[PDB]
Scaffold this active site. Structure first.
Site, PDB file in Angstrom:
ATOM      1  N   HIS A  17       0.824  -1.214   0.000  1.00 43.63           N
ATOM      2  CA  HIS A  17       0.000   0.000   0.000  1.00 43.63           C
ATOM      3  C   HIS A  17       0.858   1.264   0.000  1.00 43.63           C
ATOM      4  O   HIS A  17       0.478   2.251  -0.608  1.00 43.63           O
ATOM      5  CB  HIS A  17      -0.922   0.044   1.231  1.00 43.63           C
TER       6      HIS A  17
ATOM      7  N   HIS B 125       5.346   7.147   6.637  1.00 45.89           N
ATOM      8  CA  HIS B 125       5.106   6.717   5.264  1.00 45.89           C
ATOM      9  C   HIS B 125       4.593   7.895   4.467  1.00 45.89           C
ATOM     10  O   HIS B 125       4.316   8.963   5.028  1.00 45.89           O
ATOM     11  CB  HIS B 125       4.100   5.578   5.229  1.00 45.89           C
TER      12      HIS B 125
ATOM     13  N   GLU C  95      -3.377  13.492   0.387  1.00 41.65           N
ATOM     14  CA  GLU C  95      -4.657  13.079   0.929  1.00 41.65           C
ATOM     15  C   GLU C  95      -5.437  14.295   1.390  1.00 41.65           C
ATOM     16  O   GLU C  95      -6.539  14.621   0.890  1.00 41.65           O
ATOM     17  CB  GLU C  95      -4.405  12.063   2.051  1.00 41.65           C
TER      18      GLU C  95
ATOM     19  N   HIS D 110       3.236  11.189   6.374  1.00 47.42           N
ATOM     20  CA  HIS D 110       2.531  10.916   7.621  1.00 47.42           C
ATOM     21  C   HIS D 110       3.489  10.318   8.640  1.00 47.42           C
ATOM     22  O   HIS D 110       3.972   9.231   8.434  1.00 47.42           O
ATOM     23  CB  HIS D 110       1.367   9.941   7.387  1.00 47.42           C
TER      24      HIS D 110
ATOM     25  N   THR E  93      -6.484   6.934   7.256  1.00 47.51           N
ATOM     26  CA  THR E  93      -6.931   7.185   5.882  1.00 47.51           C
ATOM     27  C   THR E  93      -6.899   5.917   5.038  1.00 47.51           C
ATOM     28  O   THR E  93      -7.234   5.978   3.845  1.00 47.51           O
ATOM     29  CB  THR E  93      -6.106   8.249   5.175  1.00 47.51           C
ATOM     30  N   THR E  94      -6.549   4.778   5.607  1.00 49.45           N
ATOM     31  CA  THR E  94      -6.655   3.505   4.962  1.00 49.45           C
ATOM     32  C   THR E  94      -7.524   2.605   5.853  1.00 49.45           C
ATOM     33  O   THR E  94      -7.545   2.831   7.062  1.00 49.45           O
ATOM     34  CB  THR E  94      -5.312   2.775   4.730  1.00 49.45           C
TER      35      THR E  94
HETATM   36  C1  LIG Z   1      -5.704  -2.016  13.623  1.00 48.79           C
HETATM   37  C2  LIG Z   1      -4.350  -1.973  12.928  1.00 48.79           C
HETATM   38  O1  LIG Z   1      -4.376  -0.783  12.118  1.00 48.79           O
HETATM   39  C3  LIG Z   1      -3.196  -0.447  11.538  1.00 48.79           C
HETATM   40  O2  LIG Z   1      -2.217  -1.119  11.547  1.00 48.79           O
HETATM   41  C4  LIG Z   1      -3.205   0.902  10.887  1.00 48.79           C
HETATM   42  C5  LIG Z   1      -1.946   1.359  10.195  1.00 48.79           C
HETATM   43  C6  LIG Z   1      -2.092   2.747   9.660  1.00 48.79           C
HETATM   44  C7  LIG Z   1      -1.382   3.784  10.233  1.00 48.79           C
HETATM   45  C8  LIG Z   1      -1.529   5.077   9.765  1.00 48.79           C
HETATM   46  C9  LIG Z   1      -2.388   5.354   8.684  1.00 48.79           C
HETATM   47  S1  LIG Z   1      -2.559   7.013   8.092  1.00 48.79           S
HETATM   48  N1  LIG Z   1      -2.473   7.002   6.483  1.00 48.79           N
HETATM   49  O3  LIG Z   1      -3.884   7.421   8.536  1.00 48.79           O
HETATM   50  O4  LIG Z   1      -1.429   7.737   8.648  1.00 48.79           O
HETATM   51  C10 LIG Z   1      -3.076   4.301   8.092  1.00 48.79           C
HETATM   52  C11 LIG Z   1      -2.945   2.993   8.601  1.00 48.79           C
HETATM   53 ZN   LIG Z   2      -0.940   7.819   5.657  1.00 49.96          ZN
END
Ligand SMILES: CCOC(=O)CCc1ccc(S(N)(=O)=O)cc1
Ligand SMILES: [Zn+2]
Ligand SMILES: CCOC(=O)CCc1ccc(S(N)(=O)=O)cc1
Length: 259
Positions: free
Chosen positions: A63, A93, A105, A118, A197-198
């Protein structure tokens, strides 16, 4: 199994079928209408304390790519601003586009930047990241826009390792990387309550989005775009346009740290 992505067939318009909070009341990202954001005198100074940050590894997760930190102690923390308490850096990331005119985003008066960084932090009062994402104040994400212009010297070590993590599931050692080299000069910001955001799109995030973008060179962002969403040996799908569009603001206010 998770099969969400950014293509036509599994992108943001499909996510709600397996993650119904996609249509929730505090989703991210959002458009930042700069004229509607209000200066907030209540905000305390923002404190980005990355002196002792200990980077470990860089991972292509299919991703984006994550630069991971040792978050077993308060080595790199975010405090102040809208935040109550201490938030520990776990990873950073990016999200980026297929072309320089898209990729971020968040948007600023509907302007899309070429990319968005981020820096992800979890509230230490909840003990671990997995518990933090069960809390409405569990996470703080520091968002930084990237525009294309002069190279960002502090980004080049990231760019140079990407050839070694081209495909999903690959990782590389990535020690002694200083994330302070990714910040702009000013810490002027906007803040609002939102979400990841994912998928899983969890509503746990205090967003802190810096006003000042960093500049990266065209050659740097072109190397982002050579990554692959696919795994080794699979048909190549360039890792581009890995951004979610702006979501409805609903009952929220965006606060500015500055006049
Ligand atoms: C429940 C486990 O969930 C995860 O591992 C989320 C990881 C995750 C961390 C940060 C973001 S962001 N683009 O909003 O910074 C998206 C997804
Ligand atoms: Zn992100
Ligand atoms: C072969 C094409 O396959 C597909 O189109 C993907 C199926 C599929 C689409 C979207 C999602 S979601 N709601 O998690 O975003 C899960 C699975």
């Amino acid at each position: 199994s998770h099969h969400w992505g950014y293509g036509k067939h599994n992108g943001p318009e499909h996510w709600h079928k397996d993650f119904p909070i996609a249509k929730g009341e505090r989703q991210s990202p959002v458009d930042i209408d700069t004229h509607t954001a209000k200066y907030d005198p209540s905000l305390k100074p923002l404190s980005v304390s990355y002196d002792q940050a200990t980077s470990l590894r860089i991972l292509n997760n299919g991703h984006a790519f994550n630069v991971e930190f040792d978050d077993s102690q308060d080595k790199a923390v975010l405090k102040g601003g809208p935040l109550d308490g201490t938030y520990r850096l776990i990873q950073f990331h990016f999200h980026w586009g297929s072309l320089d005119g898209q990729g971020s985003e968040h948007t600023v008066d509907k302007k899309k930047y070429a990319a968005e960084l981020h820096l992800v932090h979890w509230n230490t009062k909840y003990g671990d990241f997995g518990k933090a994402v069960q809390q409405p104040d569990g996470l703080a994400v520091l968002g930084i826009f990237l525009k294309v212009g002069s190279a960002k010297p502090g980004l080049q070590k990231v760019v140079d390792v990407l050839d070694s993590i081209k495909t999903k599931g690959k990782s590389a050692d990535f020690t002694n990387f200083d994330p302070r080299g990714l910040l702009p000069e000013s810490l002027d910001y906007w803040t609002y309550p939102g979400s990841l955001t994912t998928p899983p799109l969890l509503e746990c995030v205090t967003w802190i989005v810096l006003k000042e973008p960093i500049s990266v060179s065209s050659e740097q962002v072109l190397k982002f775009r050579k990554l692959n969403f696919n795994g080794e040996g699979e048909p190549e799908e360039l890792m581009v346009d890995n951004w979610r569009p702006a979501q409805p603001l609903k009952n929220r206010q965006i606060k500015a740290s500055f006049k």
